[PDB]
Amino acid sequence: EVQLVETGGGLIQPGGSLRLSCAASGFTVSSNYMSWVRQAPGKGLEWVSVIYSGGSTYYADSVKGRFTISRDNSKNTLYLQMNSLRAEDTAVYYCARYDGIYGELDFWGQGTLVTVSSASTKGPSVFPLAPSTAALGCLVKDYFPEPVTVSWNSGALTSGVHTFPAVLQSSGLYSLSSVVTVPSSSLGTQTYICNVNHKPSNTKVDKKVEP
Amino acid sequence: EIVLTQSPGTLSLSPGERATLSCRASQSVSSSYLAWYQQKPGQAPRLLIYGASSRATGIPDRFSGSGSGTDFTLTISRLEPEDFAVYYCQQYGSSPLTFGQGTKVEIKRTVAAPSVFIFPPSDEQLKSGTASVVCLLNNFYPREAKVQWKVDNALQSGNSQESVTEQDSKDSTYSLSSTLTLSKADYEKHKVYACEVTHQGLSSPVTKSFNRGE
Numbered sequence: 001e002v003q004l005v006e007t008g009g010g011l012i013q014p015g016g017s018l019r020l021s022c023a024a025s026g027f028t029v030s031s032n033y034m035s036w037v038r039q040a041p042g043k044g045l046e047w048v049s050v051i052y053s054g055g056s057t058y059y060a061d062s063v064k065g066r067f068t069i070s071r072d073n074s075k076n077t078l079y080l081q082m083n084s085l086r087a088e089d090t091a092v093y094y095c096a097r098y099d100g101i102y103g104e105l106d107f108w109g110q111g112t113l114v115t116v117s118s119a120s121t122k123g124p125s126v127f128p129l130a131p132s133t134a135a136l137g138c139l140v141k142d143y144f145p146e147p148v149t150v151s152w153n154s155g156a157l158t159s160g161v162h163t164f165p166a167v168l169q170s171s172g173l174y175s176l177s178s179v180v181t182v183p184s185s186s187l188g189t190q191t192y193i194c195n196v197n198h199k200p201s202n203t204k205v206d207k208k209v210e211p
Numbered sequence: 212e213i214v215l216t217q218s219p220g221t222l223s224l225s226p227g228e229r230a231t232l233s234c235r236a237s238q239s240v241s242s243s244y245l246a247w248y249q250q251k252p253g254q255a256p257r258l259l260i261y262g263a264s265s266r267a268t269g270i271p272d273r274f275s276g277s278g279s280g281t282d283f284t285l286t287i288s289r290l291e292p293e294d295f296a297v298y299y300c301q302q303y304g305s306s307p308l309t310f311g312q313g314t315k316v317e318i319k320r321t322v323a324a325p326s327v328f329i330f331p332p333s334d335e336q337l338k339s340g341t342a343s344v345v346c347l348l349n350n351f352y353p354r355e356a357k358v359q360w361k362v363d364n365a366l367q368s369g370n371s372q373e374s375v376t377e378q379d380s381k382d383s384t385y386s387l388s389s390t391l392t393l394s395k396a397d398y399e400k401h402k403v404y405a406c407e408v409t410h411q412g413l414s415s416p417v418t419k420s421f422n423r424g425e
Contacts, residue, residue: 045248045256045299045310060307094255102262103303104246108255127336127343132421135328135347139336139390162349162386164374169392176374177388179347181326 002026002107004095009112011121011145011200016085022078022095022109030073033100036080038091039111048093049080053100062088085116115145122173123203124148126196128210129177134187136209137179138194142171143201150178151195187211213238215300217311225319226383230287232314234278234300242279244304250313251296252377259298260285292318295378320383324412325351329405329419332398342398346406346419348387350379357409358389361418362401367391399423 003025012018020036036048049059049069057069068081078095092113096105124143129136140148150163163178178194196205214237224230234245242263248256258267260276263283273288287294295318300311325348332342348356354375360367370393376386389406405420 044312045301047308047310050308058306098303102244102246103308104258104261104301105248105256106258106261106267108257111255125336125339127333129330129345130333132331133326135326135330135349137330137345137347139333139343139345141336141343162376164376164386164388167372167374167390169372175343175372175390177345177347177390179349179386179388181349 002097004097004107004109006093006095006109006112009093009114011115011117012085013118014086014116016116017081017083018085018114019082020080020093020095020112020114024076024078024097027097028073029071029076029078033098033103034069034071034078035096035098035103035105036069036078037094037096037105037108038089039094040088040091043091046091050103051078082114085114087116090114090116113147117145119144119172121145121201123201124196124198124205126194126205126207128207129179130209131184131187131211133181134184135179135181136192137177138196138207138209139175139177140196141175142169142173143175143198143203144173145200146174148176149197149199151197152178152180153191153193154195157192212307213240213302213305213309215302215309215311217298217300217314219314220312221315221317223317223319224290226290226292228290228319230290230294230316232285232298232300232316234283234285234311236281236283236302238305239280240283240302241304244302245276245278245283246301246303247276247285248299248301249296250299251380256299287316290318292320292383293380294318295380295383317378318383320352322412323350323352323384325349325356325387325408325410325417327406327408327417327419329421331404331421331423337395337398340395342393342395344391344393344398344404346389346391346408348389348408348410350382350384350386351410351412352384353411354378354385355411356387358387359407359409360389360391361403361405361407361420363403
């Protein structure tokens with residue numbers, strides 16, 4: 001089927017440059033009208049740039065002269081090369097296919113987060129939330145930037161899992177909790193491990209939670 | 212530039228109810244050049260309607276669109292719990308491509324009281340010299356809840372932070388975590404740590420607590 005796989009997001013300094021890639025499957029980028037769309041945290045959708053099937057390119061006024069949209073036909077990949085990045089450029093960036101006639105966006109990439117900040121990367125401290133229906137979790141504390149991914153038992157336990165939105169502490173670092181409810185009749189036999197992955201700092205922590 | 216104004220900004224309706232969303236354009240937009248998107252949390256927007264009234268691929272019958280000129284409508288004929296999302300209108304009849312500000316749709320389920328759990332800071336965290344006490348309010352509705360912290364009967368202020376999950380796509384409930392943060396020196400010089408919860412689902416506030424040395 002049709003697929004759009006995005007990479008390139010992460011932390012970069014203000015004034016810095018960063019390239020995003022969007023690898024297509026099931027169709028050609030060269031013969032299609034293609035687009036980048038961004039969404040600032042908690043905000044609406046903003047159109048960034050387009051590239052026509054015939055190669056013509058157009059840019060939002062806010063990115064003109066800083067950003068370049070392009071494609072590599074043989075790699076079947078769409079690119080956005082960004083420059084002179086500011087905090088206003090912090091957003092989830094989406095690549096999208098759209099038909100030339102009406103510019104509706106029928107296929108979207110999964111998105112990739114770009115965080116424009118001068119603050120240093122820090123890995124999270126993972127502490128257990130022990131039970132004493134039983135609730136148990138992991139406290140993912142003091143990290144920068146977003147995001148962290150939390151699974152339970154390598155993704156085998158998904159039922160009853162709540163991973164909370166991160167809160168910005170007064171220190172400038174993020175913290176969240178991930179909890180799961182389980183039958184207390186299984187606390188003796190079943191092992192519960194939270195897998196906290198923070199790719200910006202290469203931090204990959206497995207933490208066993210016990211009674 | 213064509214400005215798209217969506218109304219209402221927020222909408223809360225029960226499952227089975229009809230939902231009607233509006234998108235007003237500052238200039239005339241040809242009917243064939245208006246689209247609607249559904250965006251669920253942590254996901255890309257998904258095309259729902261294109262050309263004012265045509266359904267996209269894999270889109271259920273309950274979604275429909277209509278309108279022309281400057282007034283366009285998205286309708287969900289019968290709301291389902293999975294319809295929790297933000298909905299955006301979009302035009303490309305004129306450059307540049309513009310989006311509406313979005314309509315956040317909440318599913319108005321029946322009152323559900325929270326299950327309250329309290330967590331003492333682990334031993335490992337104490338090594339760093341900081342103590343986080345976590346109060347969990349699990350699977351409740353509506354979103355509004357009051358969480359008060361009490362340390363040896365002393366009502367705390369300005370030393371806790373709250374986080375709420377996005378509305379669940381199946382049971383339409385929320386979960387809330389409250390984290391009380393104190394220094395290890397302050398934590399080990401107190402005994403009773405309580406989390407009081409006031410919520411519509413509860414006839415009276417519920418207090419969960421623990422003793423540090425118990």
